[PDB]
Structures are given as structure tokens and as C-alpha cells.
Amino acid sequence: IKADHVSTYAAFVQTHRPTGEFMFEFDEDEQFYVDLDKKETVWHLEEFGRAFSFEAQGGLANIAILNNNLNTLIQRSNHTQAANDPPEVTVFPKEPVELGQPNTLICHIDRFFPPVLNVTWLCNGEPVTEGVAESLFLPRTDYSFHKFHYLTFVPSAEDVYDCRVEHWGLDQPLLKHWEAQ
Amino acid sequence: TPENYVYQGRQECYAFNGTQRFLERYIYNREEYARFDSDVGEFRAVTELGRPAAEYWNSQKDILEEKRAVPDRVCRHNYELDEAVTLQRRVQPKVNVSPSNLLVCHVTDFYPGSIQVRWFLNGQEETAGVVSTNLIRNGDWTFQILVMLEMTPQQGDVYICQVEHTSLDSPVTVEWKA
């Protein structure tokens, strides 16, 4: 489809956690979602939150419809469960790597299904738990998912990093290595 | 693997040259099984699983009336709002050149994604030796891109990476002397 811009509400429900998600993306970047637990709209940037609003009940009402529709399709499909599609993983820094200068490492996990995933940052074999963040499970036009994980870090010639990824389509956890080279 | 069933929905608005096209997609696992496309004007079953749903939805006049109105009532409305904010987002690229033989023009933290990055050697544009990544989406409403030039340095050569972007008054350049 020809388009200068694509604006998409994307939502899903499923048996396992996360059991629901309701978000809006503009040109493939997530602009807001509805936190279904807190029943509140969450804007990605302050630029958006100050200008825009969205009634969270609109997200909750749509998720209720999807959950009903999921129950129907489980019956109509004779409980068809899809094959697991394992993720592709890439790790790259946000800024040019300068030893001793603060940076952000990004782990992009792509082309996987279902949207059930465990991700851990490792540094020299050990989990890093501070200075981390992550995206939602983001939609793809082929109905698989992708996701971003972030780690604040100070680059150093020594350190080896891993983005360790767990998914049902994998024979064992996937460790994608990165070093400042 | 554990027992797991997934259902997805999408409501997509395609803005192009003043027009709005609306698709609403119903997906079981990864099988799109029914959809409404405003170019089409009614629901269609995408697979056999969608035949009951398309038939039923297409029999409800109020639903068709609502969906046929979405381009003008929902898509155009939200697009006008995004014209006031999202489409005015401008984050200026940072530019760094470093050697790797390649010279790397690393352009970071910019928005929107459309950008032109060109290499010049002694004032002459160099294209045949340019290996570019794709645009890299960072997921945080910024992009980056690495535009690398295959190079054979010789003393005196002056390389310049020039970046053009809607956020800039004028193109920005970084020079590297061999």
C-alpha cells in the first residue's frame, strides 16, 4: 500500500503473559499504549503527553472484544496452536563508541512469535540489572513481533556484553555477544 | 511447548497525497483471517476461518456504515493531530567520522528518518565505494545510519561527509584529512 505515513492501532491477547497489549504507532514508532493494569494511557515522549490525550477505556473496551474473539477462534480452529518462530537478535550502540564516554547499548529482538520472551543483559557473564529499559512487544506486518532492550553503559576495551534471549522457538537460550572492538 | 493461543487486531490508516485508506485486520496466531479495507468497502474473508465472520459482519449495516466512515472520521482526524505534533518532530543528526580500508560516517540520534548522507573526496562526490547500512531504528523515536566509504588514503586527500536533513538550516559536514 502506498503511503506517506502509516498510523496503526495494534493490540493482542494471548494465554501466557503478557496476556494483553494495546498500543498506537506512527510510522512504526510506538506513540502511546494503555496500561491495562493501571487503566491509564502512557505516552512515549513528553512531546506527546503534553499535546495529546486518549481515553484509556477505549483500549480496555477493545481488549475485552479481542479476548472474546480469541475464545471464539480457539473453538473455530479446533485449538490450533501456531509454530514457534525463533527470534533474530542484534546488539548495537546508540552513539559512536568512545571509551570512557556514557552510551546506550541496544538489543533488537526480531521476527519472533508468540510474544513470550525472556531477555537479560550480561556483562562478563553476569546479569546487569541497573540502567535497563525495554519496549513493548511491537507488531510486525507479518504478525510476528519485535522488541528493544536498552542498557546504559560506559564502553571499555575489556568488557564483553551479551543480550541473552529465551524463547520457545529456541533449543537453548540465545546469547548475542557485543564488545567495543 | 506450553499451551498458548494468540489473537491480534490492527487498525491501520495509510496517509498518501491527501487520501486516507483504512484497514482493520483480524488475526488468529499469525493468520490474518478477515479484514475491512476502505478501498474495498466491506469485510472480506482472508482465509476459510474468516468466512463466518465476514458474512456476519457484512450483514450488519451499522457496522459497514461505521467502517466506511473511518477514513474521514478517525484516520483523517488523528492524522491532522499528528500533523500538529508528530510530523513537526525534528531532532538534528550528530555526525562522527572515524576510520575502520573504510571511513565511517556515523550519523546518530535524528528524526525523522529521511536523510541524505554523501561522501566527497577532494570535492568530488564518491558513490561507487559507499557501503551503507540501512536506516537503523533505535526504538526511542530516533534513528542512526552508518555510511562507509571504501578508501585508499594518500597524504593530502581531504574527505568530507555531508548530511542533509529537514531539521537542519544547512547541511552539516565533517572533514577527515588523510
Binding site: 498506537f24 502511546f32 495529546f52 490525550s53 481515553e55 472484544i65 471464539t72 | 465472520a53 472520521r73
Partner: peptide, 15 residues
């Protein structure tokens, strides 16, 4: 209100 974005309403399956 701020500038309010509009939702679409997903349709209920026939069960």
C-alpha cells in the same frame, strides 16, 4: 482536554 486521539472499535466475532 488536550487534543484527543480517536479510537476505532473492533467488531465482536459471531459465536
Amino acid at each position: 482536554k488536550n487534543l484527543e486521539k480517536y479510537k476505532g472499535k473492533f467488531v465482536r466475532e459471531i459465536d
